[PDB]
Write a protein that binds this ligand. Structure first.
Ligand code: AMP
Ligand code: AMP
Ligand code: ADN
Ligand code: ADN
Ligand code: ZN
Ligand code: ZN
Lengths: 181, 283, 181, 283
């Protein structure tokens, strides 16, 4: 089976790509540059993690008048999935997104996944399916798996503000702080 | 992605197990796609034109459902034919022979006759399926016997609810007929009855609109709906399952057990991730 | 109510924008440049039709390694809706797409619309809804409405090949030929 | 867009009519969003911390469901409280007075007592809702009387199925309680019973996951489910509706008519595009 992984540079999507590779699937990555504030550190993290995993990454660009910062961006994850399908050529097999539990975002919830699954399946007569293996996990579980993955934590980046050093107050930075990461 | 500080071997095995199921689902979908290749790739524009070219009179029923699937080369319902050809001689096996002879002269194409319909094979390989009808309109089928269903209402329901299913209802019906065709002949429901069950099953369908998801839904729905005589929403009978008897007869019970066993075999094949068991269901 | 119309330069989406304006809604347009072959004539048509209707158009750009031509592009219409939401700021009110009946495309079907409606509603607690007024119409009905709209047919463009003159053989050109347009 | 040559006043009116309905749906969604503003904007992280600060012992039930909606400042179910405070004195109106006194000393915040719970209002305006419990665990409610429900199983079901609904189950329950609170007191179902009906209604929910769509679904489901005593999937009773009687009793029938009339009023208000009729349902 073929698997396209939406990669953001954080531990979650890296753990997904490691799992799919460990299952024996043919894995490739997808990074979306939509003008997010953290596009530069996220892209660097994705390039490094993909080079370690030995997978190629297709970069999809999108631009519109916006001031994307931290916090919820309405429609983001459903746009990342549809970008992977329409622009990333993920028309068969699996497309993976590293959403998990504990967030305040609807598009990280099980109802979001069930709808995205239906959308992808119905557009491909079922030949494509959306998968999110960490759907019911919380960040400490993901951190445990990432420590078993062999991937370097120093190469990951998750701050939604895009600043180096990380801002420390966005939801993802406070995830790292609560994990000593 | 962030939870804001809002806070494994079993979880890992569960995740790999689910990924395996999701990968198998996409594999079976490719199996279904290949089985539906001839229907989905059929030049319906060319079929409609050639129907006008060859044509005692054609019915006003827009069908063009003649593409074969899953190597089942049978014609037993409206969802298997391209058009009705109403015979005008005031005199079922006979009206087929009329349509066969008249078209053999008009045609460019070799005409043949089958158990129920007339197959016009053009030079490029296109097989158009023509169901002989008679005016009183009725359609054949029980050989040598005309059916009692209203051919117009069946065509209206099939097209309306096929449109409401993005043209996936007829593919699902054709896959279901392929599964049922591998059973004993006396333990097979009629093609018209299967189509009426599919109309009733998918009129209020809320699930995923793919043949892979719709096919188990049909058998799960029909194992219950076959227990009672078929009606429309008004409650008026459609006259398609009188051969089974009254509600909860022994015949309808026997069909319910078989429709339920095909559904269990589908669930078991998917749970076992068995591609050969899924192919055995289609022959 | 506010309405964002996905505009492509054809009669269908122009008819939708005219209808929403005629209902009294506050209407704005959205054009997506994803590298389609007809991006130049489509964009010109959109600019002209929008200028006549008196609506502003937000142009959303997207790019990825592709060779988009005529025919079906898997995931296009669902990507156009998600682009309008995530990148076009259509987070409340209505977002309109000019899909209609008679096409061979799943993403022009009623099941597609019902799923897109659920996606948009669930991401916005119902504050946003996807609308397609021409869903059950065929092109001759749309052509009749366009003749009542007052908009110039000469300013519309629908050829999926992007050539001037139109290619004449794509599905949209054969629509125009069957209508004497 | 292209059909390839595959081929009005009524159609125009139908299109404008549907656009009007779709616009009204978005308007009602804004009404629901405003009604749910205090719940959806509540700093649950701060509520959890302040619960630890003020705290004879707190139960291990993770709830934090204390945000008020639709100006209904009532506490009658688990989906209205933030935490249980188990009283340790081996001795319902009394155990509330204990929790009120002990916290008034520990607190920074003014403590108050209500019909069923204890409200700790901090200096910034945050009202945390604390339900007094007793160990034998039971919760109050019928005043001066303890309930028979298992508080742990209710908390487990509420959180599991709230999570399965993207945290929208409790908003829907809170809107439903607001609709029912405007009826006569003797013609109101208990808060625990409403929550058990919502668990049963949304466990297998296939519809749109918005409070706007879920609220009519609850009343449509509960007008039938209230006719029979409440059970879990095992069939074991949950002991929440013994006050209504046996299956199809006169009480349950009376509740069914009211739950059905609220659902008809919701459908009528939406069909009439009546914003004031929708606001009258919430008071
Ligand atoms: N299950 C069925 N089988 C065959 N015909 C049906 C069925 N249900 C409805 N029809 C007919 O199809 C047409 C459309 O019905 P409906 O779309 O349900 O109003 C009417 O002529 C009905 O009598
Ligand atoms: N309708 C209901 N009301 C209250 N508690 C329930 C209900 N259904 C299930 N439960 C309890 O919630 C827990 C989870 O049940 P389930 O998720 O259905 O297996 C178990 O302790 C059940 O007894
Ligand atoms: N810029 C991005 N490109 C691709 N995938 C992304 C991006 N941002 C987030 N994601 C996906 O969404 C998940 C949740 O943030 C990530 O684990 C990843 O799968
Ligand atoms: N490039 C595009 N930008 C925006 N909307 C589009 C585009 N192409 C197609 N559409 C929308 O999809 C419909 C079907 O082609 C159009 O009527 C229009 O609403
Ligand atoms: Zn940060
Ligand atoms: Zn063209």
């Amino acid at each position: 089976a073929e698997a396209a992984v939406l990669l953001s540079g954080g531990m979650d999507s890296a753990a997904c790509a490691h799992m799919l590779l460990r299952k024996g699937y043919r894995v490739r990555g997808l990074f979306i540059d939509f003008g997010q504030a953290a596009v530069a550190p996220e892209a660097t993290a994705v390039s490094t993690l993909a080079n370690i995993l030995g997978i190629a990454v297709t970069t999809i660009s999108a631009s519109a008048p916006n001031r994307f910062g931290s916090g919820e961006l309405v429609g983001r994850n459903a746009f990342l999935v549809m970008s992977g399908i329409f622009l990333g050529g993920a028309h068969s097999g699996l497309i993976a997104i590293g959403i998990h539990a504990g967030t305040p975002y609807y598009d990280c919830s099980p109802p979001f996944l069930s709808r995205m699954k239906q959308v992808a399946q119905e557009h491909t007569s079922g030949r494509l399916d959306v998968v999110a293996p960490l759907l019911d996990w919380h960040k400490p579980d993901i951190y445990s798996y990432f420590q078993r993955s062999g991937l370097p934590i120093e190469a990951t980046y998750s701050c939604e503000s895009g600043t180096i050093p990380p801002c420390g107050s966005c939801a993802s930075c406070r995830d790292r702080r609560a994990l000593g990461c | 992605g962030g939870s804001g500080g809002s806070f494994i071997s079993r979880q890992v095995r569960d995740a790999e197990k689910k990924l395996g199921d999701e990968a198998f689902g996409a594999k079976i979908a490719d199996l279904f796609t290949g089985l539906l290749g001839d229907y989905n790739n059929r030049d319906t524009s060319l079929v409609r034109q050639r129907i006008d070219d060859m044509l005692v009179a054609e019915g006003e029923l827009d069908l063009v459902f003649g593409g074969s699937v899953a190597k089942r080369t049978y014609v037993d319902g409206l969802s298997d034919v391209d058009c009705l050809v109403i015979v005008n001689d005031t005199a079922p096996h006979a009206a087929r022979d009329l349509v066969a002879k008249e078209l053999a002269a008009k045609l460019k194409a070799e005409v043949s006759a089958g158990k129920l319909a007339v197959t016009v094979r053009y030079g490029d390989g296109m097989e158009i399926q023509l169901l002989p009808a008679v005016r009183t309109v009725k359609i054949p089928s029980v050989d040598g016997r005309w059916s009692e269903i209203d051919p117009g209402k069946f065509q209206q329901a099939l097209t309306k609810y096929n449109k409401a299913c993005a043209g996936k209802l007829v593919p699902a019906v054709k896959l279901a007929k392929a599964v049922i065709a591998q059973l004993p002949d006396a333990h097979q429901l009629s093609g018209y009855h299967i189509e009426s069950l599919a109309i009733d099953a998918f009129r209020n369908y809320t699930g995923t609109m793919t043949p892979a998801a719709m096919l188990p839904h049909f058998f799960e729905h029909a194992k219950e709906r076959v227990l009672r005589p078929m009606t429309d929403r008004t409650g008026q009978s459609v006259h398609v399952d009188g051969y089974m008897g009254d509600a909860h007869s022994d015949a309808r019970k026997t069909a319910s057990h078989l429709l339920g066993r095909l559904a269990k075999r589908m669930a078991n094949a998917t749970a076992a991730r068995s591609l050969p068991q899924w192919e055995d269901l289609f022959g």
